[PDB]
Amino acid sequence: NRTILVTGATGTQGGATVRALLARGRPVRALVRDPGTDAARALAAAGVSLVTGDLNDQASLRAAMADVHGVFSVQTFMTPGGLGAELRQGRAVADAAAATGVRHVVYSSVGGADRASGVPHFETKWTIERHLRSLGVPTTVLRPTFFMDNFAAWGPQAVDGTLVVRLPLKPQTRVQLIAAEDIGVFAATAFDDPDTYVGAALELAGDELTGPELAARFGELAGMPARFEERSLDEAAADPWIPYSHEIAVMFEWFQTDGYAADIAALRARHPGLRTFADWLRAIGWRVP
Amino acid sequence: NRTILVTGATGTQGGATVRALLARGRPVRALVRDPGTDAARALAAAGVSLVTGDLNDQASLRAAMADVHGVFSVQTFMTPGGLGAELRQGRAVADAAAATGVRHVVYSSVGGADRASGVPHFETKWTIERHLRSLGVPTTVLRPTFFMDNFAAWGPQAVDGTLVVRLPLKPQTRVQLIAAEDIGVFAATAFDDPDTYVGAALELAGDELTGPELAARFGELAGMPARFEERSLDEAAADPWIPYSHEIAVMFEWFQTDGYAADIAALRARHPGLRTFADWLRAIGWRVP
Numbered sequence: 027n028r029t030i031l032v033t034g035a036t037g038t039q040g041g042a043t044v045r046a047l048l049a050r051g052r053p054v055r056a057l058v059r060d061p062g063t064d065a066a067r068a069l070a071a072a073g074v075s076l077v078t079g080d081l082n083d084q085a086s087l088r089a090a091m092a093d094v095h096g097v098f099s100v101q102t103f104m105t106p107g108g109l110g111a112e113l114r115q116g117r118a119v120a121d122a123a124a125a126t127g128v129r130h131v132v133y134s135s136v137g138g139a140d141r142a143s144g145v146p147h148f149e150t151k152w153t154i155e156r157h158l159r160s161l162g163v164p165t166t167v168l169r170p171t172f173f174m175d176n177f178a179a180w181g182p183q184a185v186d187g188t189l190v191v192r193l194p195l196k197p198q199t200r201v202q203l204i205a206a207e208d209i210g211v212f213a214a215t216a217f218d219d220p221d222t223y224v225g226a227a228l229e230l231a232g233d234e235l236t237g238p239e240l241a242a243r244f245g246e247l248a249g250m251p252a253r254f255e256e257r258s259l260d261e262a263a264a265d266p267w268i269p270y271s272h273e274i275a276v277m278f279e280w281f282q283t284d285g286y287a288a289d290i291a292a293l294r295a296r297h298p299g300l301r302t303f304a305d306w307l308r309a310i311g312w313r314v315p
Numbered sequence: 316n317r318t319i320l321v322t323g324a325t326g327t328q329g330g331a332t333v334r335a336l337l338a339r340g341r342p343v344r345a346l347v348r349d350p351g352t353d354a355a356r357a358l359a360a361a362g363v364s365l366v367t368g369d370l371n372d373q374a375s376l377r378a379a380m381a382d383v384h385g386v387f388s389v390q391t392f393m394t395p396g397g398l399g400a401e402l403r404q405g406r407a408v409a410d411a412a413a414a415t416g417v418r419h420v421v422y423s424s425v426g427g428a429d430r431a432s433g434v435p436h437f438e439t440k441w442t443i444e445r446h447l448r449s450l451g452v453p454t455t456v457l458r459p460t461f462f463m464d465n466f467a468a469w470g471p472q473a474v475d476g477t478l479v480v481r482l483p484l485k486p487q488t489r490v491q492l493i494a495a496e497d498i499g500v501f502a503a504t505a506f507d508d509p510d511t512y513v514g515a516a517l518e519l520a521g522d523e524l525t526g527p528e529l530a531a532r533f534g535e536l537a538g539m540p541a542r543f544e545e546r547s548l549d550e551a552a553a554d555p556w557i558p559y560s561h562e563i564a565v566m567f568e569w570f571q572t573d574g575y576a577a578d579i580a581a582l583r584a585r586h587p588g589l590r591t592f593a594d595w596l597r598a599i600g601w602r603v604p
């Protein structure tokens with residue numbers, strides 16, 4: 027059986043992984059909590075098999091993994107269960123894979139998880155990585171950087187005729203970015219080349235830009251003036267419109283002090299289709315609100 | 316000036332620290348968000364000076380540290396801002412101490428913070444410890460174990476004439492415990508013996524017991540039958556009546572796999588009054604609910 031079980035299939039990383047897997051010729055089974063949603067029906071229409079389960083329900087995970095070759099493992103921490111739930115879920119996926127004879131887990135972590143960042147939602151992922159390693163289940167770890175896709179909901183607004191990117195970054199802070207579509211590409215590639223990818227951990231980025239450079243990219247596409255403005259970390263941390271704003275502010279402070287460290291040139295050699303930020307803007311057809 | 320600023324002064328660790336400092340003749344200043352509460356007024360009535368401030372407000376922290384010799388630093392994670400807020404607050408205390416020339420910080424962390432536990436509210440504390448050391452703020456780290464005081468609100472209930480301690484521990488799991496009163500003793504001791512304590516980290520426990528033994532201690536005092544019963548980790552994690560239940564379940568799993576490592580005999584040699592669990596039960600006058 028060549029089937030891959032994709033967790034988080036209706037989400038950003040999982041959805042990208044579904045598309046890459048289908049294109050590469052793998053059967054895809056999607057873990058969904060509710061098979062009756064628009065998103066789940068859309069997956070089925072694309073040729074995905076649905077299985078009902080929940081990352082909090084270990085028995086349901088074992089059932090979801092019946093006869094599959096591989097599992098794509100991704101979790102979110104932005105739920106009522108928070109970071110503790112993310113951690114337990116990641117370890118549950120690993121345990122269920124071990125118990126059901128899964129041959130290959132591709133786990134999505136985060137760039138810098140291995141670098142003692144102290145970012146709470148990076149440390150959860152590191153702890154999950156360590157658990158997978160301890161079980162001996164053949165594993166590839168992907169460590170994605172800043173999702174370009176974040177800018178769909180959190181892109182710049184027009185202020186007095188100028189697009190403003192306002193984020194808790196110094197103007198000089200360089201940030202590595204990855205298109206979610208490329209996370210999917212690497213996940214699919216890993217399953218089809220285990221000789222290269224089993225036992226590997228790979229930090230993923232397709233571009234590296236400062237805030238002013240990000241603003242320039244939007245301005246060039248929009249035909250509008252654009253600028254970057256630094257937001258204070260304390261202000262970002264307190265924002266009632268940003269879920270888990272304190273953890274996110276810790277993360278942005280780490281971008282400022284440390285940051286991601288993917289080798290973009292080496293990734294492009296492996297994957298010539300690796301997307302730049304300009305590519306992301308073109309692919310989504312970004313427009314000013 | 317020999318004044319100590321106590322953060323969390325109306326709480327468990329801070330309150331214990333205030334009492335121990337007063338016993339040693341230190342002037343004490345208490346950080347309170349609202350000086351009009353009953354708890355704050357009681358501190359003032361004891362001869363503790365109040366200063367209004369908030370761990371989320373860096374300017375208020377600098378003001379609170381004006382002219383003080385030392386700071387007792389403690390944070391909670393079970394608030395709206397969660398783990399991220401705990402981390403930012405701990406680093407803010409450190410930064411304010413650095414900015415105001417504080418001569419000694421006693422920071423309360425947690426046993427095993429230094430042992431890569433993966434427990435999210437342990438990793439926050441490890442990150443705060445690291446930040447203090449990076450700044451060169453003269454620092455003593457206390458690493459308390461399981462608070463005996465937890466059993467005041469989370470004690471055993473009588474079921475069919477038997478007291479039942481029900482926790483996510485294997486019957487064989489040994490847990491180290493500390494009376495909060497003793498955390499205060501060590502904090503005050505550290506300020507008065509900086510030669511010994513500046514630069515030090517000390518894991519704190521006054522007893523070490525299994526679940527069955529904890530049950531036996533309650534039974535002995537109450538003069539009735541008692542037993543321990545293991546609760547599953549999944550059930551504990553999902554408990555709607557336990558705040559941050561998922562993080563707490565990760566912690567209990569770590570008790571099972573790893574656990575605390577204080578040298579109790581060595582601590583009792585330093586502090587002969589170090590409380591056993593039986594001592595704590597007697598001191599608070601524990602009674603069957």
Ligand SMILES: NC(=O)c1ccc[n+]([C@@H]2O[C@H](COP(=O)([O-])OP(=O)(O)OC[C@H]3O[C@@H](n4cnc5c(N)ncnc54)[C@H](O)[C@@H]3O)[C@@H](O)[C@H]2O)c1
Binds near residue numbers: 035038101
């Ligand atoms: N946004 C970024 O820039 C970025 C960069 C690196 C890493 N990450 C990490 O990505 C992860 C989130 O991935 P995403 O953006 O694809 O998430 P998402 O929110 O787009 O998707 C979450 C998916 O998980 C599913 N899900 C949620 N709870 C579930 C449960 N209990 N059982 C089964 N399924 C459940 C959702 O229905 C959805 O399919 C986070 O851990 C985050 O830290 C994000």
Ligand SMILES: NC(=O)c1ccc[n+]([C@@H]2O[C@H](COP(=O)([O-])OP(=O)(O)OC[C@H]3O[C@@H](n4cnc5c(N)ncnc54)[C@H](O)[C@@H]3O)[C@@H](O)[C@H]2O)c1
Binds near residue numbers: 323328368370462
């Ligand atoms: N309970 C245990 O067994 C145990 C064992 C080891 C460590 N710990 C750690 O102890 C810490 C909590 O200490 P505690 O039990 O003394 O807490 P607590 O809840 O008893 O007291 C918290 C204190 O902090 C104050 N406070 C809260 N938010 C504040 C803010 N924004 N600004 C200023 N003051 C604020 C409260 O008013 C109170 O004075 C946690 O980090 C926990 O992980 C607990």
Ligand SMILES: COC(=O)[C@@H]1c2cc3c(c(O)c2[C@@H](O)C[C@@]1(C)O)C(=O)c1c(O)ccc(O)c1C3=O
Binds near residue numbers: 173180268269
């Ligand atoms: C354009 O900026 C954003 O979209 C921001 C942004 C950026 C990241 C994450 C966010 O959740 C948000 C949102 O909080 C809105 C905002 C403004 O703060 C995130 O969770 C994350 C993550 O879990 C793991 C690695 C990451 O690199 C990230 C991020 O980079």
Ligand SMILES: COC(=O)[C@@H]1c2cc3c(c(O)c2[C@@H](O)C[C@@]1(C)O)C(=O)c1c(O)ccc(O)c1C3=O
Binds near residue numbers: 482
């Ligand atoms: C008797 O057991 C308890 O009181 C439990 C308990 C125990 C601990 C903590 C709790 O919050 C609770 C509550 O969740 C109720 C319950 C039942 O789960 C906690 O926050 C903590 C902590 O931050 C740091 C170190 C610790 O060692 C601990 C604990 O040991």
Ligand SMILES: [Mg+2]
Binds near residue numbers: 055
């Ligand atoms: Mg299929």
